[PDB]
Amino acid sequence: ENMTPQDYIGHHLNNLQLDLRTFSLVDPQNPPATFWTINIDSMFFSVVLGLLFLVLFRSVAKKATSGVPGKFQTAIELVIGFVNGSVKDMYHGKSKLIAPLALTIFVWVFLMNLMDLLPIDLLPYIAEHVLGLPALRVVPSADVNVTLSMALGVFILILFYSIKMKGIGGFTKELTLQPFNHWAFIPVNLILEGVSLLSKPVSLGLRLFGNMYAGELIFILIAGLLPWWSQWILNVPWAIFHILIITLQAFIFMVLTIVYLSMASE
């Protein structure tokens, strides 16, 4: 067993990347710089968690009744309550898509984060020492590319909804006149307001990414730099606090999505 503590830590920081052109696995010992290598672990957990959310909720929704209320049915109606309560006041237009957009983002992001509570060495053990895989980590949201995918989708939606609900004719006026409104300032005005527009999705993505990266880092540091008796004593309060972090961060991501779009369209 070749694991020195600092070298041991490195293997957590390394992902399970594929190669698009040969379908080969990129090994941790030598990670060349290349964008065309999908992180199998991140995508696998992302899609699996989305599928489990869909399976459970669609299974009971497909069977739902208005009779005697059930145990799991109550949980469904309660999270529908929190989501619909947010949507019900922050949004005012007709659009159908806003509500399921918020719902799926909330639950799916929370599920990505929820994996972080799972013990750090265990499932990578079943990755390496069972199925023969060179590396693993189990929190997709701690990887950049899922968060930027969602955030830049929200960017597409900002453009799309804003142009749909006020047109280019007024969109140009807003993006050029503000904030000083006087015609000599227009060229300088657009420079400021454009990066203002792009800062919204970028901040969404980086905000979520930073929090989850740091959480898994706490587990990595606990496992790598500390002895058993201190591992448990420091890990317990950490996990308890991380519960609050992941709950509020998921809710924040959803709320801010709704709010950005509302600011553009309404």
């Binding site: 922050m90 800062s199 970028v202 901040s203 980086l206 924040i252 709010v259």
Partner: protein, 77 residues
């Protein structure tokens, strides 16, 4: 060599100043939210909604700083 010594320091300055900015900003904003919660009870959910709206705007520039500090630390150095 000479690279990592300064690249860690760059990241450190970045995320330290970001920590100041975010912590103090949400400190002032949250203190006003809590005097509002003490003053008029049972408007806690509505003021909580406004608090999250404003909080998202406070965290914007600091989270850009945080993300780029993480980039500098674990990508460039």
């Amino acid at each position: 060599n000479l690279n990592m010594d300064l690249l860690y320091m760059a990241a450190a300055v970045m995320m330290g100043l970001a920590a100041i900015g975010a912590a103090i900003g949400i400190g002032i904003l949250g203190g006003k939210f809590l005097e509002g919660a003490a003053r008029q009870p049972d408007l806690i959910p509505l003021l909580r909604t406004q608090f999250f709206i404003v909080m998202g705007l406070v965290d914007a520039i600091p989270m850009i700083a945080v993300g780029l500090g993480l980039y500098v630390m674990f990508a460039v150095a």
